[PDB]
Amino acid sequence: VERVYQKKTQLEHILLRPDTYIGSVEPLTQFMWVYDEDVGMNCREVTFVPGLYKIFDEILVNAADNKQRDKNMTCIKVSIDPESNIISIWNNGKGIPVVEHKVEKVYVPALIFGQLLTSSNYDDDEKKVTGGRNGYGAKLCNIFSTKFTVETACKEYKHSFKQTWMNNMMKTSEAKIKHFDGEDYTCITFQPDLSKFKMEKLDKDIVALMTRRAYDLAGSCRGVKVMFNGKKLPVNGFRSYVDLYVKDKLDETGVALKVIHELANERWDVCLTLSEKGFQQISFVNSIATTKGGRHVDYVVDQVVGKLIEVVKKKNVKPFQVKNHIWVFINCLIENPTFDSQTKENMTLQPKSFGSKCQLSEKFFKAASNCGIVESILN
Amino acid sequence: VERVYQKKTQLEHILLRPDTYIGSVEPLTQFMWVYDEDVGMNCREVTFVPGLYKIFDEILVNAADNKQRDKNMTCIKVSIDPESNIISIWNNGKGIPVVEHKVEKVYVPALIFGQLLTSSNYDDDEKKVTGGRNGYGAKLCNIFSTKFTVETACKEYKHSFKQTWMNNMMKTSEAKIKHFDGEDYTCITFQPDLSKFKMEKLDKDIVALMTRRAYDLAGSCRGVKVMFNGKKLPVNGFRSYVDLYVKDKLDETGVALKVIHELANERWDVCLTLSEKGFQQISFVNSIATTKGGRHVDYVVDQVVGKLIEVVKKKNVKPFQVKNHIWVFINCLIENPTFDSQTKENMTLQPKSFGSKCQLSEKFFKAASNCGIVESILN
Ligand SMILES: Nc1ncnc2c1ncn2[C@@H]1O[C@H](COP(=O)(O)OP(=O)(O)NP(=O)(O)O)[C@@H](O)[C@H]1O
Ligand SMILES: Nc1ncnc2c1ncn2[C@@H]1O[C@H](COP(=O)(O)OP(=O)(O)NP(=O)(O)O)[C@@H](O)[C@H]1O
Ligand SMILES: [Mg+2]
Ligand SMILES: [Mg+2]
């Protein structure tokens, strides 16, 4: 009875059932986009552990989210040392208040990095476009790290704070609190617990995925510069990011891909071209990589599929056949987005709730008509 | 500081962020398979709340899971009264021990239906093929119900137990404990909290989805009979279930769909036919509807795509083009399956971990050659 029927603590449950929190802790092999030291941006077969990619992603999106707390933020700095097994993500703009929380009686940084279900994103009356929603991400990286360090400096509270966790968030010690006068920042430094992922080292494949995610951020997070291992990424907006995929590329007819672009408004940036590999989508919601898509992709793609069916009808086909020929790129800001998992690969919020619209122009639909999709359908 | 940075309890978090536990609590409109009072099995546009479908599904899969605790189980009885807003799922086979848990000091049924993170599925050394993994499902139905009743009778412990929860698992009272001599059963009776889903009533669309799920169970759960509203479902195994989709159907050439079947072994039952609507999959893992697919679908479909590429090559194409023409049906039993969410729509366990193989026969691949897929590709 006592061995059959068991209760678990929340902390036990995360280590026993990591998949619902961070994705699979087993290897996956699949074709995907990565940023390699030899070829840069390329689609190749990759072997990696999603859980390890995800704990990195949780800290990267948290940096991107600071651009919403402080629009004066200009910089995110990512560093990965496979030899030392140390990852750091640094951001400027406002730091975290270095002060005792009057309800929980702990330093605010210790509360929100060292206790589960803690967030500044729990009040949905504020209609934020942060990626953060659930109050898990940072603690999940902590739990899946042999060492996890939080360094934040907050001019307002005129202190700096540095606290270190170890052994899967099971050990800490007193925060170092100091006088601070200067330029706000937060720096998260962690050594991922590679034993949790049955890995010996951050190999080339995981480093290539984490590097690409740093490019995604440069493309997705408006007005923020990104450095990777001390070097500025040469991406200055979503259009330059999309170029990394399509600028140097030919259809299998030997004609350059025709890339169509519309910034419908501040919250919706769309590129479209021809796919010869079936439906492809590269999408971001609040700087989250929505790698399974969701309602934002369908909302944009249905408008295009609509207008392209018309054009084809009127020069001599079914939605799924048109979509088969679409490569779409979407950078969007959604108020209070919803997802079916902590991993946020699929965004489930209905379009009427987005807080904005993407009504693509007749100009955009005319250009879509010319980009080679119509011709393939006809052919 | 105290309003910006907040901590939530696990119970608060489930109501604040229901999407990661039960799926969207907002309406969704999409084409799907349902079982209607007028046409039976059919694909039509449906408007429903995934969260309400899911709390029903959690109790249905729990009944299916009892066939693993007691292989003598023969019967699941589902009843839905939209007028009274009462759903009941009854099963036979072994009941739940009616006895005080010696660690948690509560009746075992009160522990596992009234406290979060409680399960008989937390020991993965047992290599089970239950759908249950996380210790949430029943509590989530409880939390999303105005009234939730647990009735179980356990001959071994010679007692029956009946306890009622109300107001989102926030109220209960003493269990009724009685002498019991007879035939074991469990009956879960709940009134879903329709205000949580912005609904007035269990309408036709949600009832049609819940009804279809009762057909899925009759198809998926080997050696268990299913009744819906007091009437036995005329499905006696997976092949009869697949017939509900394809038996009375023509390709758009006016030729009957050719349906190929192999029971590779006790744990793998596969049907294949032609799709004219792009890739389609209907799959079950341990009686869970894996509506987003996962590694089990890819494992089966890659073998077929492989052998069909060969056949085409040798009578005058790319994987995605072959898959475009496949309608696959899969009923499988996977040891300790993993998923990216509590909703279990996508099964992420790698095939080397399944605990079994599905090596489809040359006989099956020859029949696949003849079922119209090759001809469409060629054409
Ligand atoms: N770089 C940062 N700068 C400022 N505040 C931060 C930073 N990283 C984390 N935070 C704060 O710490 C909180 C906890 O982060 P986290 O655990 O990732 O939760 P979240 O981002 O709110 N939600 P989620 O990521 O969906 O689980 C956030 O709500 C922020 O208030
Ligand atoms: N019909 C039933 N008959 C017998 N035992 C049951 C029944 N329904 C639930 N249980 C038991 O109650 C426990 C709690 O159910 P539940 O909360 O759904 O968790 P789970 O099925 O173990 N995991 P999950 O459904 O993934 O969250 C199960 O582990 C079973 O031991
Ligand atoms: Mg976060
Ligand atoms: Mg369950």
Who among B1, B20, B320 is closest to A134 (CB)? Answer: B20
Cα dihedral B269→B272→B278→B283 (10° resolution) = -10
> Which pair of tokens denotes residue B5?
């940075």
Q: CA B33, B35, B41, B43 torsion: positive or negative? A: negative
Q: Are A39 and A176 within one domain?
A: yes
Q: Do A198 and A318 reside in the same domain of the chain?
A: no
Determine the Cα–Cα distance for residues A285 and A347; give it in Å rounded to an integer: 8
Burial readout A176-214 (b: 16 or more C-beta within 10 A, e: otherwise): eeeebeeebbbbbbbbbbbebbebeebeebbbbbbbbbb
Signed CA dihedral, B153, B154, B159, B162: sign only:
negative
Are A263 and A335 within one domain? yes
B102 contacts A2? CB cut-off 8 A: yes
Is there a domain that residue B3 lies in?
Answer: no
Q: Say if A173 falls within a structural domain.
A: yes
Tell me if B248 is assigned to some domain.
yes
Helix (H) and strand (E) counts in chain B: 11, 20
Nearest atom of ligand 1 to the alpha carbon of A188: 1
Is residue B24 located within the same domain as residue B38?
Answer: yes
Do B73 and B197 belong to one domain? yes
> Determination technique for this PDB entry?
X-ray
Residue type, A247: K
B37 shares a domain with B121:
yes
Handedness of CA A358, A361, A364, A370 (dihedral sign): positive
Is the residue at A2 inside a domain? Answer: no
Question: Do A36 and A120 lie in a common domain?
Answer: yes
Residue B2 lies in a domain: no
Structurally, chain A folds into a number of domains equal to 2
* Torsion, Cα of B124, B126, B132, B135 (10° steps): -60
- Report strand pairing: B268-274 vs B260-265: antiparallel
Euclidean distance between CA atoms A51 and A343, whole angstroms: 9
B88 and B205 inside one domain = yes
Which of A2, A5, A22, A116 to substitute to test the interface with B, most B CBs within 10 Å?
A5
Asked whether residue A346 falls in the same domain as residue A249, the answer is no
Q: In what order do the strands lie in the sheet with A280-285?
A: A260-265, A268-274, A326-332, A280-285, A288-289
- The encoded tokens of residue B252 equal 């758009």
Ligand having the closest approach to the CA of B66: 2
- Cα–Cα distance for residue pair A117/B7, rounded to 1 Å: 6
Q: Are B144 and B55 in contact (CB under 8 A)?
A: yes
Q: Show the CA angle centred on residue B251, arms to residues B245 and B255, nearest 5°.
A: 110
Q: Of the candidates B253, B269, B302, which is a domain's last residue?
A: B253
B59, B78 contact by CB (below 8 A): no
CA distances from B25 to A153, B117, B168, B240 (A): 39, 22, 15, 33
Using a CB–CB cutoff of 8 Å, tell me whether A121 touches chain B: no
Cα A33 from Cα A211, distance rounded (Å): 11
Q: Which tokens go with B59?
A: 């109790």
What is the amino acid identity at position A360? Answer: L
Q: How far apart (Å, rounded) are the C-alpha atoms in residues B217 and B284?
A: 9
CA distance B292 to A59: 28
Closest CA to A142 of A188, A177, A175, A185: A188
Question: Distances from the Cα of A118 to the Cαs of A9, A112, A115, B12, in angstroms?
Answer: 17, 5, 7, 12
Largest CA distance in chain B: 74
Q: Do both B285 and B246 map to the same domain?
A: no
Residue A198 sits at the chain B interface (C-beta within 8 Å): no
User: What amino acid occupies position B61?
Assistant: V
A95: domain range? Answer: 8-253
Residue in A308, A194, A325 with CA at minimum distance from that of residue A253: A325
Does A3 reside within a domain?
A: no
The B residues from 7 to 46 touching A (CB cutoff 8 Å) are: 7-10, 12-13, 16-17, 19-20, 23-24, 26-28
From the number of C-beta atoms within 10 Å of its C-beta (0-12, 13-18, 19+), residue A245 rates as buried
How many angstroms separate the alpha carbon of residue A135 from the centre of ligand 1?
7
Residue A200, in any domain of the structure: yes
Q: Which two tokens stand for residue A278?
A: 């079936």
Degrees to nearest 5, angle at CA A240 with A234 and A241: 85
φ, ψ of residue A260 to 5 degrees: the values are -100, 140
Give the dihedral of Cα atoms B198, B201, B207, B210; nearest 10 deg: 50
Q: List residues near ligand 1 (CB under 6 A).
A: A 58, 62-63, 65-66, 91, 96, 112, 118-121, 132-139, 186
Strand runs (DSSP E) across A159-296, as ranges? 159-166, 171-172, 176-179, 185-192, 225-228, 231-232, 260-265, 268-274, 280-285, 288-289, 293-294
Give the H/E segment covering residue B86: strand B86-92
Q: Is the Cβ–Cβ distance between B341 and B279 less than 8 Å? A: no
| Distances from the Cα of A362 to the Cα of A62, A264, A308, B8, angstroms | 37, 12, 12, 47
Judge if B38 and B176 occupy the same domain: yes
* Nearest residue in B to A343, CA atom: B340
Can you tell me the distance from the alpha carbon of B111 to that of A209, in angstroms, rounded to the nearest whole number? 43
Note whether residue A19 is domain-resident: yes
The residue out of B253, B281, B298 marking a domain boundary is B253
For A87-90, the CB contacts below 8 A with 24+ separation are: A87/A56, A87/A59, A87/A189, A87/A190, A87/A191, A87/A192, A87/A202, A87/A210, A88/A187, A88/A188, A88/A189, A88/A190, A89/A59, A89/A60, A89/A62, A89/A63, A89/A187, A89/A188, A90/A63, A90/A185, A90/A186, A90/A187
Q: What is the 8-class DSSP label of residue B173?
A: -
Q: What is the DSSP string of B102-123?
A: TTT-SBHHHHHHHSSSEES---
CB atoms within 10 A of CB A127: 9
Q: Confirm if B46 and B30 have CB atoms less than 8 A apart.
A: yes
Assigned token pair, B158: 């010679």
Task: Give the contacts of B267 (CB within 8 A, at least 6 positions apart).
Answer: B129, B332, B333, B334, B355, B356, B358
Are residues A157 and A306 both part of a single domain?
A: no
**Ligand 2 site, residue B121, Cβ cutoff 6 A:** yes
Which spans in chain B are helix H?
Answer: 10-16, 19-22, 50-69, 108-114, 137-143, 204-220, 238-246, 295-313, 319-323, 362-369, 373-378
Domain's final residue, options A233, A253, A273: A253
Judging contacts by C-beta atoms under 8 Å, the chain A residues touching residue B97 are: 1, 5
